[PDB]
Structure 1
Amino acid sequence: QVLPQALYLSNMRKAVKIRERTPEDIFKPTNGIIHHFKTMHRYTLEMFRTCQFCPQFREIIHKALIDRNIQATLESQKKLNWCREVRKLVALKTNGDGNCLMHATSQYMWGVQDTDLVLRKALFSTLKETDTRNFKFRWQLESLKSTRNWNDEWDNLIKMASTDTPLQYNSLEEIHIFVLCNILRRPIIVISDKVGGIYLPLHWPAQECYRYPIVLGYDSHHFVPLVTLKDSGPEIRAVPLVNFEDLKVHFLTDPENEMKEKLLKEYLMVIEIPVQTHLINAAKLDEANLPKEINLVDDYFELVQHEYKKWQ
């Protein structure tokens, strides 16, 4: 009614500043290394506290921003926000046009979706122009564990990542998430009911990576970001790495698989969270770190507050 249907519409100018900055941050080095983001990959969105409003109005906000359906589904399958020691994650709405992985990933860190296809076009560019040998071998090895022409199956996965029309764009498998996390130099954790698990940017030393994860959620054939709520009470800001069965760690090689637990401690910031008394591993999540210049959430909030006084 009153409030606009997406964060970006709160300040369309600001939205563009972001969309313009994103392509300029991509590096594309000469020595053969994967294309990557210089700086913008370290940013992280946090949702505003919807707790302090009259529930007639709290629902008006949630209707606009939150994917109530997909959150319910992951909560009802005891996969999202089951632990009472960690802070609550909220699922944001994401355009299901075939590029939702990118939209959700883009949203996690900037608030804007991938409507300009910047992340999508980067994933494809990397697959056409960089050394894909290692990626392929990892995919063969993961695919074997789960008469076929491997080279054909691979060359098809590359074609799918393109922006060409086949849903307006092709949907993306698990190998794409793995390549995406290496372009970002930041691990990605997907929560679901085989996509679910942990994607580590193993083409980079952990010293060169941002060691807070992007947290996506997955149901139907739909991705969304699972953003934390801002700066609230005394629960720890972290995602549990066990559902106790551990989350899958995709595309490891055999030597890496032997040192799996040491790798999670390398690429993420692991902490022991206690659970009913057993202790479980969990990765620390990022505090909101978007500067005012490109912070859409702060704008939407000041807008909500004003529209709430009008409502009271």
Structure 2
Amino acid sequence: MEMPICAFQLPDLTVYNEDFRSFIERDLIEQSMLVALEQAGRLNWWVSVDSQRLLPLATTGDGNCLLHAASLGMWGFHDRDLMLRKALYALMEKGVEKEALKRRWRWQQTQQNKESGLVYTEDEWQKEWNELIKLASSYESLEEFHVFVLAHVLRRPIVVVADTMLRDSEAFAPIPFGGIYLPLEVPASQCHRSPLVLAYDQAHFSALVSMEQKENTKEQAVIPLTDSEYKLLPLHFAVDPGKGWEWGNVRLASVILSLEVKLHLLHSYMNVKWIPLSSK
């Protein structure tokens, strides 16, 4: 199967080794995240003729450790979260793409509501938006949209590896983090192409190293842009209805993205490669 993939930069461990402070349960947690993601077929699920094994690199922090993990995946140390948090805030509160980002959030949040018939009032819409802003101000876990905003802060696409559901013996709850986050409100010419790649499991974010890095230096690795069933990964908040679009289904049909359009967005913001692979 010819499937779309993309190269990404592995964490520079040389910086990591210098400043590691006790997180004794690191190996135990990392191992459980690896097994969970591999068994569910979300990580290292493919095989190709031309081999790598990605391993979750856990980190300490508050909540799901999104910013600590992002900092780890970007620079090899996690204490850059503070600068990320303020930048994430300023982009939402005073950013020039604020209105457009808000439209993207409300539109997707509206669609997810339609599946459960929970229609929110206008006052409730404005309340939920300020709760999003408050979560980024400077404890409580960041949400899906904050990952989308983080991509804009970095001006770099973000790929999150995760299961789709929380399961008991049999899904009972959804996991919204898995997929592709593109910096769509930043012109592609002003963005980096190589994605920040993170994993999510047991309510925690983590960076991703490769097994080969334990043996010697390895810079690049491969991450798939489809799931293990060869379906393109979800593009988070990829739909922006116009400023003239009124919230009050021919109209709804026009804004929804086709597979061709999704591929075009990926080509615009990522260096997509195609290799023959198959699932395990």
Matched ranges for 1:46-61 at <5 A = 46=12
1:152 aligns with 2:127: yes
Contact 2:11–2:76 at 8 Å: present in 1 too?
A: yes
Alignment of 1:83-102 (within 5 A): 83-85=46-48, 87-98=52-63, 100-102=65-67
Q: Tell me if the contact between 1:80 and 1:191 (Cα under 8 Å) persists in the aligned partners.
A: yes
2:189 matched to which residue of 1?
207
Question: After superposition, what is the alpha-carbon deviation per residue over 1:13-35, rounded to whole angstroms, capped at 9, x for unaligned?
Answer: xxxxxxxxxxxxxxxxxxxxxxx
Q: Answer 1 or 2: which has greater strand percent.
A: 2
Gaps of 5+ in 2: 1-7, 15-24, 113-118, 164-175, 240-253
- Does residue 264 of the first structure (1) align with residue 266 of the second (2)? yes
Percent identity, aligned pairs only?
Answer: 41
Aligned partners of 1:162 and 1:224: how far apart in 2?
22
Larger RCO, structures 1/2 (Cα 8 Å, 6+ apart):
2
Deviates more, 1:221-230 or 1:266-275: 221-230
Superposition pairs of residues 177-256 of structure 1, within 5 angstroms? 177-193=147-163, 194-228=176-210, 229-230=212-213, 237-243=221-227, 244-253=230-239
Q: Does 1:143 align with 2:104?
A: no
Higher helix share: 1
Matched residue SS, 1:239: strand
Residues 65 and 93 of structure 1 are in contact (CA less than 8 Å); yes or no, is this contact kept in structure 2?
no
Q: 1:176 to 1:224 in 2, by over 3 A?
A: same
RMSD of the TM alignment (CA)? 3.0
Q: Specify whether residues 220 and 83 from structure 1 end up closer, same or farther in structure 2 by C-alpha distance, changes over 3 A only.
A: same
Q: TM-score, normalised by structure 2?
A: 0.69
Aligned length in residues: 218
d(CA) in 2 for partners of 1:268, 1:156:
31
Contact 2:9-2:194 within 8 A present in 1 as well: no
Q: Could you tell me which amino acid in structure 1 is paired with residue 67 of structure 2?
A: M
Residue 129 of structure 1 and its aligned partner are, at CA, apart by 2.1
Which contiguous aligned blocks of 4+ residues in structure 1 show a shift greater than 3 angstroms? Answer: 62-66, 228-234
The reply on whether 1:118 has 2:120 as its aligned counterpart is: no
Query: How has the CA–CA distance of structure 1 residues 208 and 116 changed in structure 2, closer, same or farther, with 3 Å as cutoff?
Result: closer
Q: 1:130 and 2:95 equivalent?
A: yes
For 1:134, the aligned partner's letter is: A
Alignment partners' CA distance in 1, 2:195 and 2:28: 22
CA-CA distance at 1:242 after TM superposition: 1.1
Q: 1:43, CA displacement in angstroms?
A: 7.4
Summarize deviations over 1:49-76 as a string: whole Å, max 9, x none.
xxxxxxxxxxxxx965982121111011
Q: How far does residue 150 in structure 1 lie from its aligned partner after superposition? A: 0.8
Question: Quick one: which amino acid aligns to residue 178 of structure 2?
Answer: G
Label 1:80 to 1:102 Cα distance change in 2 as closer, same or farther (>3 A).
same
TM-score (norm 1): 0.63
Secondary structure of the residue aligned to 1:252 is coil
Aligned in 2, Cα 1:207/1:115: closer, same or farther, shift over 3 Å? closer
Amino acid at match of 1:241: L
